[PDB]
Design a protein around this ligand. Structure first.
Ligand code: NAP
Ligand code: A1EC4
Length: 304
């Protein structure tokens, strides 16, 4: 299934997360993106920050050139990093992303975070309305088929939606979302504005020691998810993915393992009951896996 975006384009509701920590050799991003496309992934989420756009792009181009898929079948996302928020830097950043991936366009270009950074942690002060205007210019130039934001709260989304002269609403807001942090309020707000919430860390994050508290609860060990996995003869990961699909959320899933990449495409093979849905709804504990002790003082910190 795909969801119709508010600009008329369609987004597959299951996306493949490509990010890996820098101690992961860059070859792996190439090999696994190919496996993801062979497994049935069409939505691919990359970013300038990930230092993998060349490898992810080459996997997409490899699968096109061998007849597996056509460019039209692939929904490719890149993101504008926070050091490029100043409006004159936005298009060059997208163009640079296009050359690394060797693609003519991205299906979706996002503002990675509202927390602007020094162009070149050093904060910067940018009016994100001007950043969005340059976002809109890229869509009008054909370099991005759709544009959106990421890690925005409700107030930051309102800043864009109430912008005078606004030409394109953001098609999506990609935010951390999982049973332990389910974003029900923001989902309802985005739903009311025809903005698709896209969930990252839907499986509980990669728990990287540099940003995730070691003592934070492991999402996939959660007793309710494992009991539901046993009930439906699925895995705890699949229950968490299916939860987002049935609440109208487009869900990303990162795996660099061949068997788990294929497992995640079985999210379409079963359904949760309404009672199952409410049990997962009760697991929220406002848990941000991405601890931001260095960023909580940013004027645009989205969790304040
Ligand atoms: N806009 C933003 O600020 C932002 C922030 C974070 C992430 N993202 C993007 O969205 C993706 C979000 O995912 P994430 O990086 O936070 O990790 P994730 O999708 O929440 O998954 C976490 C871990 O689950 C494991 N996994 C995948 N399938 C599994 C399965 N059936 N069973 C058990 N474990 C499974 C993976 O380990 P294995 O690799 O070993 O399988 C993965 O490291 C990212 O890759 C990135 O593209 C965006
Ligand atoms: C806050 N982070 C860590 C980080 C890691 C991965 C992703 C992603 O996967 O998008 C986003 C942010 C930094 O500033 C570096």
């Amino acid at each position: 299934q795909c969801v119709k975006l508010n600009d008329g384009h369609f987004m597959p509701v299951l996306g493949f997360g490509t990010y890996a920590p820098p101690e992961v050799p860059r070859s792996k991003a190439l090999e696994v993106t190919k496996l993801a496309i062979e497994a049935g992934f069409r939505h691919i989420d990359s970013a300038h920050l990930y230092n993998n756009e060349e490898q992810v792009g080459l996997a997409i181009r490899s699968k096109i050139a061998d007849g597996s898929v056509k460019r039209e079948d692939i929904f490719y996302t890149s993101k504008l990093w926070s050091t490029f928020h100043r409006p004159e830097l936005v298009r060059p950043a997208l163009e640079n992303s296009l050359k690394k991936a060797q693609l003519d366009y991205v299906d979706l270009y996002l503002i990675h975070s509202p927390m602007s950074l020094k162009p070149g942690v050093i904060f910067d002060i940018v009016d994100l309305c001007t950043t969005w205007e340059a976002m809109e210019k890229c869509k009008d130039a054909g370099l991005a088929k759709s544009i959106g934001v990421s890690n925005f709260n409700r107030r930051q989304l309102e800043m864009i939606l109430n912008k005078p002269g606004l030409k394109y609403k953001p098609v999506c807001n990609q935010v951390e979302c999982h049973p332990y942090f389910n974003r029900s309020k923001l989902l309802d707000f985005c739903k009311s504005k025809d903005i698709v919430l896209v969930a990252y860390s839907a499986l509980g994050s990669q728990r990287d020691k540099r940003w995730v508290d070691p003592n934070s609860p492991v999402l996939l060990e959660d007793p309710v998810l494992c009991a539901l996995a046993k009930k439906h003869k699925r895995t705890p990961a699949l229950i968490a993915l299916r939860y987002q699909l049935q609440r109208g959320v487009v869900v990303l899933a990162k795996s660099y393992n061949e068997q788990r990449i294929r497992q995640n495409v079985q999210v379409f093979e079963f359904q949760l009951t309404a009672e199952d849905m409410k049990a997962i709804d009760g697991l929220d504990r406002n848990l941000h896996y991405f601890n931001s002790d260095s960023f909580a003082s940013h004027p645009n910190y989205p969790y304040s």
